Amino acid sequence: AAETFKLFNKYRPETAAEKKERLTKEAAAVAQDASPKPYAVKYGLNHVVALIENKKAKLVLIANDVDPIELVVFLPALCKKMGVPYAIVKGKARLGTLVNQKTSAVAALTEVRAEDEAALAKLVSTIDANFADKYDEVKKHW
Amino acid sequence: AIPRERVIKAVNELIKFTSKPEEELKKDLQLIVVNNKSFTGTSKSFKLKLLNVKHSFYKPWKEASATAVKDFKVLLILKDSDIKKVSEDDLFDQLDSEGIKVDEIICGKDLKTVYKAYEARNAFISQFSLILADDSIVTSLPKLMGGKAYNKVETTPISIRTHANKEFSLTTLTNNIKKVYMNQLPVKLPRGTTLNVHLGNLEWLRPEEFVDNVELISEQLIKAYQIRSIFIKTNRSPVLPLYYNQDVLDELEAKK
Amino acid sequence: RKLTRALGRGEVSSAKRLEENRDSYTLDHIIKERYPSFPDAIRDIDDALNMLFLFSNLPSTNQVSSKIINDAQKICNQWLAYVAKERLVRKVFVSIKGVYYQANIKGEEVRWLVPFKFPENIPSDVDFRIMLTFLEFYSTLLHFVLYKLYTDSGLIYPPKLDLKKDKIISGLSSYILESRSPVASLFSAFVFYVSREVPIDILEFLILSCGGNVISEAAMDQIDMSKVTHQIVDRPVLKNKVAGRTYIQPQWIF
Amino acid sequence: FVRAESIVAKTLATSREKERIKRVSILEDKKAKNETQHIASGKDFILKITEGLIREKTTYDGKPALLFIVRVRGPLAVNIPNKAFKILSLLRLVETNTGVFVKLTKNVYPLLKVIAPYVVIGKPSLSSIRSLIQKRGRIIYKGENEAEPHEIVLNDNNIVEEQLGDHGIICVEDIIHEIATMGESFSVCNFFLQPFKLNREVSGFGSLNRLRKIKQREAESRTRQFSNAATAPVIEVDIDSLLAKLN
Amino acid sequence: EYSGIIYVSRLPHGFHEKELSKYFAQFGDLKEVRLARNKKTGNSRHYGFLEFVNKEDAMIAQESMNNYLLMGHLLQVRVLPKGAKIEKLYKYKKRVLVEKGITKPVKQLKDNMKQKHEERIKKLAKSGIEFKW
RNA sequence: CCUUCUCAAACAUUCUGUUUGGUAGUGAGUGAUACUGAGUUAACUUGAAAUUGCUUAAA
């Protein structure tokens, strides 16, 4: 979990003050090119469900504490049916810190920088070894 | 020194061997040069010696690679503080005429982040065939580039000059790059009795210039390196005995 | 609380923005309420001066900040500069616990103590928070009084400091005042030469207040002695004499 | 509990520091032997870094210079090598937030090279020297009726005479003059004076002081430079500004 | 069943015998810590073996460190069965070359060089090349 | 859970040349062809792969 959050905190999205600065530069260049392609985590629930169903998501993080739980109880099954790597983590508050909110139901990486593709792949393999093979038997039992 | 008669008969013999009734690999000409006391000593040296040669084999390399799938390209590693001043467009303007093409302009920060993984770094480093690096950064490269890059004499970088006096200069950079490409040839100096010079391929270039190249290489190396034995060789080929000295072996026991 | 939230969430940029976009309290309205009369402010200026001079001499600890000490030193230097410029030092009394000065500030006799420049061992067994609170109030009152006196006397407040002279010798001589009897007329055209061991700050303040100019041997160590009229020097047995100079001791000036 | 990542990071950092000190030791051995056959470069560089940041690279004149050296904690996960540890102990700068005055000669340049990651080097102004002596000056003093001595402040001037009277040093201002002018008996007075214990730039762990510590670390990363090349210029900064902050 | 010996693989740089022993001591007493190393230039081969007094301590260490992510390496730890302990993997330094005595004098080595030239002379024709001298 | 030897000297001034010096690398493995069991010599596969040749960065 510490490794996953250390990865995601490099892709924490734009804050309002930073958006004002970037719109300032675009206005200078307005009168594609003005700003570079952004990289950030995706965090809305409907947005991430859409990304999963389009298989655009490379890794999904799901808060374990969602009330009502019916909002995320289908996400692991959806991610399995779609082949998207997923991980259940402790804290909607911790997920929300990643996206400048108080809480966040989910977070996701779809695109990563070149210097982080390898770290993302190793994180996925680590979660597979520690979380998929470890909990596969027990998550199906009452 | 070495008369041209020996060289031309050697070339005829080599073509006879290479016409035997893959191909490019076995067609490469290696000039084994054997030294009495090695070439550097007890301390290693990854510095690539550049030798002034009339005929540049890199343009034949470009042509043969265009005909083949080898995909000749030139890498230009520079300083982190001058990669911003260097522009691909200025490079194309200043090097299009003289037949020089620099593919990608990479940085130490790129070797530290973008390719800080053995697979990606090896792919990137093995794709290129000629490397030119600022002599400021060549000292720091062996940690950034790794050992797999410096292992083969093709991939190890070449120290080039890019600054004029105390500051970077585009004219200095382009002049040094052109001079390196069309005026010099790379070798290494092992901690061993022998080395070889990669003249190129028999398919690429003509014997009329191979003779000049081998003669100049032999004389340039023997002038300073106290060379005793020099062998022309091809891949899967016998050693072609060319030069033989009976002088330097006396100091072997003096050192002993 | 909000800065704690920003730091605990990891948004250092928003933490910096919050810190920048804040303002501390002021005490000027309190100064006006407490002392409606400038004579009353001058009346109570004495303990303010005493505490400011006490704090300027302390080293920085885990409690007292270098910022606080430097502000106090600046206020003390400005007060001394004004007093020396307008020549209103009337009495000086050197004791073991430093030096007492008595000045005629707008018809009020103002007396204060300046400790000698030595590394006092701070006890820390007394409450520093209360002393810092009093120091804050006294600094506010002294800023008010200094601005008033500077403007009335015709100077500009705050005076611009000279960085080269601050580098040479930190203290009274750095602050330079630009405009727009018999004590004040004493020592007209007298060049004193202060050797190393004489307390340069004490001597220079007293001389500038009572007329006359100073040449410090300590102040030349960074890198003349021809127009010097007096020389002050403390030694058991001094070296050879100029025989064209005059020799005195600090108690002579006092 | 001790974590594997902490162990490994310490090992790697310490090995790199050992390598840097080794290459510096070899380079200075060759330079002292005065052989330029196989050398990166054969002279001593000083980098003045002042205020972004403007840098000046200059060649050491060789004339002795009064330097002020303030100990700061080095990079994390680096356990100090024995050579640097011995040099710092000889300079009695073992713990952080201390400072000493040092003579700068060609015999002292390589020592600064070896101890560079743990110290901040500057040339103090006379105001800084005077403030240090007049605010934080402590000595070890022994009494006639006291079996064991104890450290005192520099309050009394008669102690200066009674201890260092044969060198002509009579008072604290004499000590200050000897240091500032870099004259004789400077070493004796420096030995007499204890290392100056400075105060931490930021202390406390409230939200405000944590933000101050973050800003301070940012500025330190801006100013201090860690290089592992043997041809490393000795880095000197605004020690006067640092001392106005720490004193 | 299971023994008290552990095989560790996918080690990063800077995880040597001493570092492995220091880290795994806080799990329990150790009897042998050994690491694979390269001969020519002393470098770790990123695997090693450890021996525990208590086989349960060994199993606990394996469960703790089985799939630990450690600075980009997904460590692997396996408890070995009975027997098959550590037998090799001596800590090798960086070897430095050492000169060997040339008993053959100048005359003998020059005669050897002559004979090597003679071997080239009688080998080229059988190889299938024709060239002067 | 650190983060990598980012240029020096002289000679010449020709908006620049010459010389010289500075570079000890993840591991494992395939492989040819020779040079003197130690030092050398073309290409090749790979997830960062792998079973035994100082203390205010504290609490």
UniProtKB/Swiss-Prot annotation, chain B:
GO terms for cellular component: nucleolus; preribosome, large subunit precursor; proteasome complex. It is found in: Nucleus, Nucleolus. One of its GO terms (molecular function) is protein-macromolecule adaptor activity. Keywords: Nucleus, Proteasome, Ribosome biogenesis. It comes from the Eukaryota. Its main location: nucleus. GO terms for biological process: maturation of 5.8S rRNA from tricistronic rRNA transcript (SSU-rRNA, 5.8S rRNA, LSU-rRNA); maturation of LSU-rRNA from tricistronic rRNA transcript (SSU-rRNA, 5.8S rRNA, LSU-rRNA); protein catabolic process; ribosomal large subunit biogenesis; rRNA processing. Present with 45900 molecules/cell in log phase SD medium. An adapter protein that specifically links the 26S proteasome to its substrate CDC4 which is one of the substrate recognition subunits of the SCF E3 ubiquitin ligase complex. Required for turnover of cell cycle regulatory proteins CDC4 and GRR1. Required for synthesis and nuclear export of 60S ribosomal subunits. Required for vegetative growth. Interacts with CDC4, PRE4, PRE6, RPT1 and SCL1 as part of the fully assembled 26S proteasome. Interacts with pre-ribosomal particles constituent NOP7. This is Proteasome-interacting protein CIC1. It comes from Saccharomyces cerevisiae (strain ATCC 204508 / S288c). The chain holds residues 31 to 305 of 376 of the full protein.
Swiss-Prot record, chain C:
It comes from the Eukaryota. Residues 182-254 form the BRCT domain. The keyword Nucleus applies. One of its GO terms (biological process) is maturation of LSU-rRNA from tricistronic rRNA transcript (SSU-rRNA, 5.8S rRNA, LSU-rRNA). One of its GO terms (molecular function) is large ribosomal subunit rRNA binding. GO terms for cellular component: nucleolus; nucleoplasm; nucleus; PeBoW complex; preribosome, large subunit precursor. Its main location: nucleus. The keyword Glycoprotein does not apply. Keywords: Coiled coil, Nucleus, Phosphoprotein, Ribosome biogenesis, rRNA processing. Induction: Expression is down-regulated prior to the diauxic shift. Disruption phenotype: Essential gene. Reduced assembly of 60S ribosomes and accumulation of halfmer polyribosomes. It is found in: Nucleus, Nucleolus; Nucleus, Nucleoplasm. Belongs to the pescadillo family. Component of the NOP7 complex, composed of ERB1, NOP7 and YTM1. The complex is held together by ERB1, which interacts with NOP7 via its N-terminal domain and with YTM1 via a high-affinity interaction between the seven-bladed beta-propeller domains of the 2 proteins. The NOP7 complex associates with the 66S pre-ribosome. Also interacts with NOG1. May also associate with the origin recognition complex (ORC complex). Component of the NOP7 complex, which is required for maturation of the 25S and 5.8S ribosomal RNAs and formation of the 60S ribosome. Present with 4530 molecules/cell in log phase SD medium. This is Pescadillo homolog. It comes from Saccharomyces cerevisiae (strain ATCC 204508 / S288c) (Baker's yeast). The chain holds residues 88 to 433 of 605 of the full protein.
From Swiss-Prot, chain D:
Keywords: Acetylation, Nucleus, Phosphoprotein, Ribosome biogenesis, RNA-binding. One of its GO terms (biological process) is maturation of LSU-rRNA from tricistronic rRNA transcript (SSU-rRNA, 5.8S rRNA, LSU-rRNA). Its main location: nucleus. The keyword Nucleus applies. The keyword Phosphoprotein applies. It is found in: Nucleus, Nucleolus. GO terms for cellular component: cytosolic large ribosomal subunit; nucleolus; preribosome, large subunit precursor. The modification Phosphoserine is found at S203. It comes from the Eukaryota. One of its GO terms (molecular function) is RNA binding. Belongs to the universal ribosomal protein uL30 family. Present with 7720 molecules/cell in log phase SD medium. Involved in the biogenesis of the 60S ribosomal subunit. May act as a specificity factor that binds precursor rRNAs and tethers the enzymes that carry out the early 5' to 3' exonucleolytic reactions that generate the mature rRNAs. This is Ribosome biogenesis protein RLP7. The chain holds residues 55 to 322 of 322 of the full protein.
UniProtKB/Swiss-Prot annotation, chain E:
It is found in: Cytoplasm; Nucleus, Nucleolus. GO terms for biological process: maturation of LSU-rRNA from tricistronic rRNA transcript (SSU-rRNA, 5.8S rRNA, LSU-rRNA); ribosomal large subunit biogenesis; rRNA processing. GO terms for cellular component: cytoplasm; nucleolus; nucleus; preribosome, large subunit precursor. Keywords: Cytoplasm, Nucleus, Ribonucleoprotein, Ribosome biogenesis, RNA-binding, rRNA processing. GO terms for molecular function: ribosomal large subunit binding; RNA binding; rRNA binding. Its main location: cytoplasm. Disruption phenotype: Essential gene. Abrupt growth arrest prior to substantial depletion of ribosomal subunits. Fails to synthesize the 25S and 5.8S rRNA components of the 60S ribosomal subunit, and exonucleolytic 5' processing of 5.8S rRNA is strongly inhibited. Arrests at cytokinesis and fails to assemble a contractile actin ring at the bud neck. Residues 4-82 form the RRM domain. Present with 4280 molecules/cell in log phase SD medium. Involved in the biogenesis of the 60S ribosomal subunit. Required for pre-rRNA processing and cytokinesis. Associates with the precursors of the 25S and 5.8S rRNAs. Component of the pre-66S ribosomal particle. Interacts with NOP7 and RRP1. This is Ribosome biogenesis protein 15. It comes from Saccharomyces cerevisiae (strain ATCC 204508 / S288c) (Baker's yeast). The chain holds residues 88 to 220 of 220 of the full protein.
